[PDB]
Design a protein around this ligand. Structure first.
Ligand SMILES: Cc1ncc(COP(=O)(O)O)c(C=O)c1O
Ligand SMILES: Cc1ncc(COP(=O)(O)O)c(C=O)c1O
Ligand SMILES: Cc1ncc(COP(=O)(O)O)c(C=O)c1O
Lengths: 475, 475, 475, 475
């Protein structure tokens, strides 16, 4: 019995669980053969994945470096201190001006921890509306329901895009803010094509005596590589995920100002007051022990984020996206805001006579990952009139500009085939669209032709995180 | 720079971050050479670690199987459905009576998601107090501050131990419940060495029209092996972590009743109301994209947890703990509650003339990782009067029983040397103890030879999750 | 002078409203003919009613004396300052240790304003349970619904009587307070025959670092005459109505500590922090303009409360109650707590085989105003087994020594006739009892006899606030 | 001494309390000698004062007519039922579509009871901003502090006037409402010279699924005489004081929709859901026993409100205000909105090169009661730019129109004297203005240049509620 269970523990994945090993091999094939245009998705390095799947997952280390509750954390302390040092180092942060918490398990909980730390329950947040490019962790309630728990435990009011220009309406946000008296404002989007006017946000915030939180989840990589202006120039607190633009493990970081804020009008020192509160909201407030395996992975990701290879990659992300937007517009498409400053494009399909659900379904059965997105001009939010697409994943594969021109041509083909399926559709709901899409074989023929072109094009490019040879699904 | 970054993506961790690779090798040596006594720690299988370190981390899959926001989740859906199937199977649960959520990132958020799903903000919870054996996710407030976030967003009142027996006082709890009118009662603890009376707690909850939440974080593996009564016999909602007794990756699960609750007196049948609320509280309520790599790992952990080797291992952790308790009684130490029914022994060190701090410091010097603890009888919070120690970690490596007697003997040697240092310290606070402990040349000699004995006993057993051979740190 | 109205503004209640003039004359006859035994009732002086009926009602005077919004409040300021001075004088209070707010419109809002001033929303209050003798303005919730709004905006838990003695159970109060951690404890009852142990309440509040609020609405007159221990000996804040035992107009007062709290056995100088908070919670917090007509009336009532006639009256209220309790016990009745220390008695009718509802109905048919009251042993709130009666009202009319012996005799007659009507009832519900009582002529004869005895007795005594000579309904 | 205390209760006010009798006689003289222009003020009839000063104050009657806790309420039930009937009649309301609660003690608590009945704590209210003509009981918070407890227990956001036009900006309210998602919107004002566009606010509330509360405190009289559009045409709930434009005693009423709301177009009848909630929020929720003396007074006021001479008086209030505004404009004053629809004008004194504080001080020393008021465009409040003036009080005394031309002329004289004192003001701060105004016998003798004119003009008019002959201070 005694050595049998020891061998069960050291047996590899292929011997103990063939079905999970096989699901992973299938997913490897799907990542190899597919166009990944979902801008929140990326391919994480083998280095990061080896650290994430290490024995660091075994150690319980409640607390912080040099103030832990459990013993035997000398090496875990080394890893977490190195992670903090490299985090401040990646975004060019003076350690006496800025502090960082790397224990946050993911983006949504990271924001909730900031709100719990800095706000009393029911205090007021403004953030970019979800159907306008905001995240659920900013707050969201419909006409009918509280969707995000941020809206349950705090009072949230959205600020919206200018419907005609597709940029954030800062004139309506400032007016809104004088009336609503928010204690914190979130500068951070998921589905926004442009760069925040952090200077204007800081002005609105210190007039309204408000906290400036930046959610740079979507662009964190870009600001580590200096290709887009750093929110750390103006923000009081910056949160991010570690796994999007930044391309590390699934996790989060909370940066905050520390040290001296200013001298006030009586000559006394005003000290920043976010470190203790954020650190305590994370633990023992809302989390327990940290995930030291993901902290090790994040430390490796942050070392990669400071290299010239990384800077090259993210200026490529930007250039690929500029050329992608040019191709999309020249093919006869409307972008909201009419271009991009970053890693994504939001296509407004309203003028082509089809919405985002039908286009997304056709694109997916052709192995091109996009996601339906609401657009300015949408009457509903349940019926999205747009499609969101991004570069970072395929660019990580080594896609360059010509390659995104081919992907735009295949997207054009997908939209036109989706228009043909809508014309021939035997109904008006989404189920009838999918019915005629899989009840006519002309459309299934053209779907497989598009899929075939996508797979032949994608397979030419390197696999990230594993080697093509030792795969299980080569054909 | 065209293909020059692809190799940086696929390079090994040793050639990527040599400093993190080295820190991991140090921690591997520490796990191999060390007496791991921390009862919330364990050694996870290579199969789990390989799945956690896979490319499953790359996919965004907001939502649930067959109802995701993004497409291309065929394989992620397979993994999550298999995880749910194996979760229900590991605890012998009728899929028509019990449902499971496997997306919860950790234990504290899992409980908070149950509260957010089933209670309005500021509704009332009863739970086991913290300094008697509770967890922070149950709530805690002293005369000064709200520490755990749960006491911020909900109204919490504790139930206490019978101060002479060391079991839960089921009467003071019933009385205080009639007065406090709680909406939910939490059964489950950390530093509590006994198993609960679920039947009486179901009776109290039925009387007070209250929700029975069982937190089985500390005993989850023990419940899956059938060696202790299943809380699923009487509980409405069961939360657990996946990392400790269950021996899987760092995560959590929420189980909830579904289907028929009872038939009301008007003839109508009433259905449970937990599934939709809990699933929505988890996402889109408080979390974002699921961590599919940890879900894959958890699926393989749960498959291991159904096997006879696993049942043998859990009966072994129980037997090792019984022998450890007896071997400590022979030395002459006090166990709080007068013994143990499970995997942990909380030694009551007050009546030996030394605290938890000094013994833990010396044990960490000797590569014997345990943790300071407060028992009923202490003087304050951070002056601890107990040591908590657990079998599951060392038992994972093949510790048998007589091996835990040698562990008890070396712990006795550690506490005796700690007494020798405390009596000879010129001062009375922890600082004078630590000063005199490592400016000695006599006690430092005894510490190095104890550590030598510890390493000699430890290194004999197999390394769990990696091979002894390619350890970059041999001796 | 240049008008089509003014005619109706200076016309008496004459033909301006014959129906209301008539209803007032009816109520005057009812106050003359009847036994008023409801212990919260009293007869107000003519001087108070004349001040309440003055043109002081016309002035808007938001704010406080010398700190008002509007001009022309020099005389209103005189009246409010005089009211405050006489309030502090009527309870023998040093103006440098106590302050008073006389703008609170009634008892329930007065308590709510104290909570709003001193507690954040959802902070914790303890108070005497309503079916055990508490008030709704202290909090009340059933198994299904929040009844009092104090329970909506604050978290309330009750303390109970010892159902064996009939006194407040201070032991279970102290215990449940240790668990519940209240910010404020209310010492105040309605249906309670005994005096508060303010010393023990002070000790509990000092232990829990909690605010002692005494709600002396029922005994304020008794406290003003000094014939009962003063809650100002121990309380942080004292609230009262102005219209019960104190015998003024319908209103309320909030008294609070001001100046030094204690040089404190641990450091700095602590000042009482209640004045500004309470004054601001009253206005501009929860009320608008003060009712200066009611404040003038209250000033007259407080002047009367300092006279020897008034002291005689209150010691008479106490003596009448002692003799009334003796007569009730000598006629075979059970009193809750077995007697009284104050102005009322709770008769426990359970041993006489009849409930409070049937006895109250029969007493009302006889023009004896009392009210059903729950007693220990009562299963539910719907069917009370006791009767509450008190002496302030009829004592105001000059009921002396043996007059409450006649009250006891006529109550005994009502109980015995009620038992006869219960025996002859066809059904078990109160509707069948009332049907028999009005529609069975046997009982009609004895009803007329006791009503006659009641009226012939009451009519002999002086009318309070009007002349018998000018009564539209004199016979 | 039972003959004493009896006599003390029946002694008149002039005998018991000469000091209060004297203060009332002083206030009578002040009501006789002066121009009352504060538009929230009025002179109550002797009829309602005699009912308010009646023995109805003595009866406790918690509950509602036909459902009281205490017996002996047959005549109080008559008065409350008559009050309800006459309330619904005086506003021409179908008793099967509207119900009324007449127990509410005053305006501020009446609104708080509506919020407590119809909203959960922390739910959202929109109301007219306080410096734009709103009331504190609709919510108010500054940069630093929460002023009204409505803003403590509920989440409040204001809507503003158009700063150029002086009408409510209904566009900006609709926009704000989309973003802020209010559960209730308040159509109601205290310093707003126009009638609400109730139809537009019905449209906004129907769009936002929001409750329309009208607060007609200032215009209830005008609505009762039918000389302005009735908010009941559109509101879900109407609140009012009883003591301003309506001219009754100090109290409040809550009207609400009851019965059928609409057919849900699925077949079902949906019923209005206000009556039970509001009635329970008033009692037992936030109040105790009703003030039956005030309810009797209100019944008399409501009977007067249905007479032709009442309609004449309210038509007169309107005509007097039109002529007052015309006189002010022909004398070169700036009125916010350029005129009036109702009983008041808000004069913008900044166009004459002075503020509201200086003009108010000079007017008060001349016995012209007005009040400083924020005009839209003020550089903050604290020093307001306007004076608020109204016609109901002096119109009650019989001021006809030519009389308000004299009022306008004497106000103009007061403003010009204040300008002369500002010219001589050595400094700019208000203390130097008061110093110059008192210490400069040129200005002191011109102040008596009016006051004398004002006093002679006021003395020529009838005293309301008392007799010129029986007055004490007749010289
Ligand atoms: C702007 C922004 N903030 C926060 C998050 C939260 O991410 P997660 O799903 O890891 O919780 C996201 C999503 O990735 C995001 O786009
Ligand atoms: C102790 C106590 N508090 C508060 C109140 C409420 O006073 P009111 O009915 O004037 O609102 C009462 C009623 O008499 C009372 O007895
Ligand atoms: C619009 C409005 N609401 C509420 C109130 C509150 O009145 P009170 O001072 O009687 O509380 C007023 C004042 O008269 C008012 O004008």
């Amino acid at each position: 019995s005694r050595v049998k269970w020891t061998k069960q523990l050291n047996a590899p994945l292929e011997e103990i669980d063939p079905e999970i090993a096989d699901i992973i091999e299938l997913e490897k094939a799907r990542q190899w053969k597919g166009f990944e245009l979902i801008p929140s998705e990326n391919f994480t390095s083998l280095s990061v994945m080896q650290a994430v799947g290490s024995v660091m997952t075994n150690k319980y280390s409640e607390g912080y470096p040099g103030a832990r509750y459990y013993g035997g954390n000398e090496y875990i302390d080394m890893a977490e201190r190195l992670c903090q040092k490299r985090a401040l180092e990646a975004f060019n942060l003076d350690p006496s001006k800025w502090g960082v918490n790397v224990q946050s398990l993911s983006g949504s909980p990271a924001n909730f921890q900031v709100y719990t730390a800095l706000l009393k329950p029911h205090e007021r947040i403004m953030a970019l509306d979800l159907p306008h490019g905001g995240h659920l962790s900013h707050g969201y309630q419909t006409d009918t329901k509280k969707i995000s728990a941020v809206s349950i435990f705090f009072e949230t009011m959205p600020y919206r895009l200018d419907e005609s220009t597709g940029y954030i309406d800062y004139e309506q946000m400032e007016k809104s803010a004088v009336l609503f008296r928010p204690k914190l404002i979130v500068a951070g989007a998921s589905a926004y094509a442009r760069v925040y006017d952090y200077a204007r946000m800081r002005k609105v915030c210190d007039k309204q005596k408000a906290i400036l939180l930046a959610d740079m989840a979507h662009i964190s990589g870009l600001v580590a590589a200096g290709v887009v202006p750093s929110p750390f120039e103006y923000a009081d607190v910056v949160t991010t995920t570690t796994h999007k633009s930044l391309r590390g493990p699934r996790g989060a970081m909370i940066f905050f100002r520390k040290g001296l804020k200013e001298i006030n009008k009586k000559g006394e020192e005003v000290m920043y007051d976010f470190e203790d509160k954020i650190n305590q909201a994370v633990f023992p407030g809302l989390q327990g022990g940290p995930h030291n395996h993901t902290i090790a992975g994040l430390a490796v990701a942050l070392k990669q984020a400071t290299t010239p290879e990384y800077k090259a990659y993210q200026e490529q992300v930007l250039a690929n996206c500029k050329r992608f937007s040019q191709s999309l517009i020249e093919r006869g498409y409307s972008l909201v805001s009419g271009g991009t400053d970053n890693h994504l494009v939001l296509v407004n399909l309203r003028d082509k006579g089809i919405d985002g659900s039908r286009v997304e379904k056709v694109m997916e059965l052709a192995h091109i990952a996009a996601n339906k997105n609401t657009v300015p001009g949408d009457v509903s939010a349940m019926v999205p009139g747009g499609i969101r697409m991004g570069t970072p994943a395929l660019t990580s594969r080594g896609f360059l500009e010509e390659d995104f021109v081919k992907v735009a041509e295949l997207f054009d083909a997908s939209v036109k085939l989706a228009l043909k399926i809508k014309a021939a559709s035997s109904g008006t709901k989404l189920k009838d669209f999918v019915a005629t899409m899989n009840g006519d074989e002309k459309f299934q023929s053209e779907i497989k032709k598009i899929r075939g072109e996508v797979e032949e094009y994608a397979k030419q490019f390197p696999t990230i995180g594993f080697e093509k040879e030792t795969m299980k699904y080569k054909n």
